[PDB]
Amino acid sequence: ITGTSTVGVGRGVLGDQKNINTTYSTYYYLQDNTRGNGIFTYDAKYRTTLPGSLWADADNQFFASYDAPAVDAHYYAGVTYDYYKNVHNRLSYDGNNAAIRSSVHYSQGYNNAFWNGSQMVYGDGDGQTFIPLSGGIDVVAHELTHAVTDYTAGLIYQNESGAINEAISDIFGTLVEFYANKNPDWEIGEDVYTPGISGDSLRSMSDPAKYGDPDHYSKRYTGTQDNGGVHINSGIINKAAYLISQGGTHYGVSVVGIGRDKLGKIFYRALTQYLTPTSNFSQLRAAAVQSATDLYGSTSQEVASVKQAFDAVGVK
Ligand SMILES: [Ca+2]
Ligand SMILES: [Ca+2]
Ligand SMILES: [Ca+2]
Numbered sequence: 001i002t003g004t005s006t007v008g009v010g011r012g013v014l015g016d017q018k019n020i021n022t023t024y025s026t027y028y029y030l031q032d033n034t035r036g037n038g039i040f041t042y043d044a045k046y047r048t049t050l051p052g053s054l055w056a057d058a059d060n061q062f063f064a065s066y067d068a069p070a071v072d073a074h075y076y077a078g079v080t081y082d083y084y085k086n087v088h089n090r091l092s093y094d095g096n097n098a099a100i101r102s103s104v105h106y107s108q109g110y111n112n113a114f115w116n117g118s119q120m121v122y123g124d125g126d127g128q129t130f131i132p133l134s135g136g137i138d139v140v141a142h143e144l145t146h147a148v149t150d151y152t153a154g155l156i157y158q159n160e161s162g163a164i165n166e167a168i169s170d171i172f173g174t175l176v177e178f179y180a181n182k183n184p185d186w187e188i189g190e191d192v193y194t195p196g197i198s199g200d201s202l203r204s205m206s207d208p209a210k211y212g213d214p215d216h217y218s219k220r221y222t223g224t225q226d227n228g229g230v231h232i233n234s235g236i237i238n239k240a241a242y243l244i245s246q247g248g249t250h251y252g253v254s255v256v257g258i259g260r261d262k263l264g265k266i267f268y269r270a271l272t273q274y275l276t277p278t279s280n281f282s283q284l285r286a287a288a289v290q291s292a293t294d295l296y297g298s299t300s301q302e303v304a305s306v307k308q309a310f311d312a313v314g315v316k
């Protein structure tokens with residue numbers, strides 16, 4: 001909508017207070033004009049018709065229980081935008097400042113979130129398995145990263161290319177969580193997962209097997225469930241990325257870690273320069289090796305660590 005840029009205040013899913021960029025035009029709208037061509041947040045009103053209504057508020061204060069998922073979807077979309085702009089010089093998900101749109105209160109008891117090809121969508125959860133999923137910054141960044149992938153490598157959402165697609169979203173979801181620097185970790189979804197169970201998460205990048213996901217290519221899932229295990233076999237790539245950053249010895253193969261920032265540069269370069277819709281795990285390794293070579297040189301520790309990491313998870 002046309003209006004004037006304003007700044008509201010509210011509370012997110014976890015009870016924390018934050019300021020949010022809004023737009024005034026009779027009502028105050030969750031429309032942030034400070035980032036590219038706008039970040040827009042919508043109310044799906046417990047239904048499945050998308051996007052719903054652009055979120056309107058009478059007084060620019062967002063402290064109602066019903067407001068909380070919208071506050072976090074809106075605010076964490078902005079953080080993710082800032083990450084890609086400041087760290088990777090990428091303007092929104094298409095590289096040309098496309099509007100970022102999100103809908104919250106999707107359906108009833110919906111224990112998921114997703115990028116639907118054009119926008120983000122967040123359930124409120126059922127209060128047992130999940131609380132409203134926009135409360136997790138790694139969830140928000142995970143899903144917006146799908147938009148980035150779909151515009152760049154275009155990895156097909158099945159089998160190994162789909163597992164790479166999922167892993168890329170976990171990797172940059174985690175790096176955005178570290179970038180915002182609020183209780184960062186190598187776990188996925190911990191802030192909105194199982195409110196009655198402390199210390200768990202949906203997936204682990206540091207130890208995928210913690211939740212039954214493979215941590216080595218020999219353990220990969222080869223059936224047809226989950227579009228050929230896209231959320232399962234992602235553990236193999238997640239483990240490789242964790243090793244590249246943090247280091248470790250995995251099934252006897254030692255990896256010298258090179259840090260989060262270099263992990264991000266290597267995988268962003270691989271995603272945007274070398275990966276294709278049909279890339280498999282071995283092709284990802286080659287993309288990452290070439291990316292590290294471009295960035296740091298053929299004889300660098302960085303290249304050596306990429307090789308060791310993919311060796312450790314059995315990807316040749
Ligand atoms: Ca209000
Ligand atoms: Ca965390
Ligand atoms: Ca996390």
Ligand SMILES: [Ca+2]
Pocket residue numbers: 190193194195196197198199200201
């Ligand atoms: Ca939990």
Ligand SMILES: [Zn+2]
Pocket residue numbers: 142143146166169
């Ligand atoms: Zn995903």
